A paper describes a structure:
The camelid single domain antibody, referred to VHH or Nanobody, is considered a versatile tool for various biotechnological and clinical applications because of its favorable biophysical properties. VHHs have typically similar structural characteristics to those of human VH domains, consisting of four framework regions (FR1/2/3/4) surrounding three complementarity determining regions (CDR1/2/3). To be employed in human therapy, VHHs from camelid origin should be subjected to humanization processes to minimize their potential immunogenicity, similarly to other conventional antibodies employed in therapeutics. In this study, we investigated the impact of CDR‐Grafting using a humanized VHH of therapeutic interest on the affinity for the antigen, its thermal stability, and its structures.
Residue numbers in the entry: 1 to 28, 31 to 126
The structure:
């Protein structure tokens, strides 16, 4: 089915910007999300988009700073990250969300990218 390759991570000063890319080599899904996981913390959904692209959601903490978009033709998902804060430091993952059966229930069967590290530090 599908391989997701992420790029665009890096080290930036507070207030800096990065653009993450999630290139889907192949095809399979209900939608597409960007997630992030900092050490000791869970994998937070920070931005989500529908197929038609007019349903976008954002975590409260990234509203007005992050923008999710898709290029149909390039099969590529993007996250534009502006006004980055130390607390945005995490590994960022793209996922294509599918469904699968488990003992009478549905669970989210995700196609996961490998992750791209974002570090926001005065050291940058």
């Amino acid at each position: 089915e599908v391989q997701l390759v992420e790029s665009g991570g890096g080290l930036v000063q507070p207030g800096g910007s990065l653009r993450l890319s999630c290139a889907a080599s192949g095809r399979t899904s209900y939608g597409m999300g960007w997630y992030r996981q900092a050490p000791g913390k869970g994998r937070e959904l920070v931005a989500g988009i529908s197929w038609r692209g007019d349903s976008t959601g954002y975590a409260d903490s990234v509203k007005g700073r992050f923008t999710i978009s898709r290029d149909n033709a390039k099969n590529t998902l993007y996250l534009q990250m502006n006004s980055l804060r130390p607390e945005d430091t995490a590994v960022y993952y793209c996922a294509f969300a599918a469904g699968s059966a488990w003992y009478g229930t549905l669970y989210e069967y995700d196609y996961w990218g490998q992750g791209t590290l974002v570090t926001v530090s005065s050291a940058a």
